[PDB]
Design a protein around this ligand. Sequence first.
Ligand SMILES: [Ca+2]
Ligand SMILES: [Ca+2]
Length: 81
Amino acid sequence: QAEARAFLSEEMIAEFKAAFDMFDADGGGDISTKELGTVMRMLGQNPTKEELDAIIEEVDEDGSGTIDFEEFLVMMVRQMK
Ligand SMILES: [Ca+2]
Ligand SMILES: [Ca+2]
């Protein structure tokens, strides 16, 4: 979470915040399975709660069951590497 904000350009960070901000429908600061499922559906997919659970669990370092912004950058940086 330290190296992600390092790796990246301020430009990339900005576009990532925008996206995050799109996913975080209630503006509370983290993405829940409900939020995740809602957007996935917009993208044609049909995920189950399990599936959603498994996706967040890969990037969830604090065990909150939700994805915050820092966990969100890591999932994209990890994506770029
Ligand atoms: Ca939220
Ligand atoms: Ca979390």
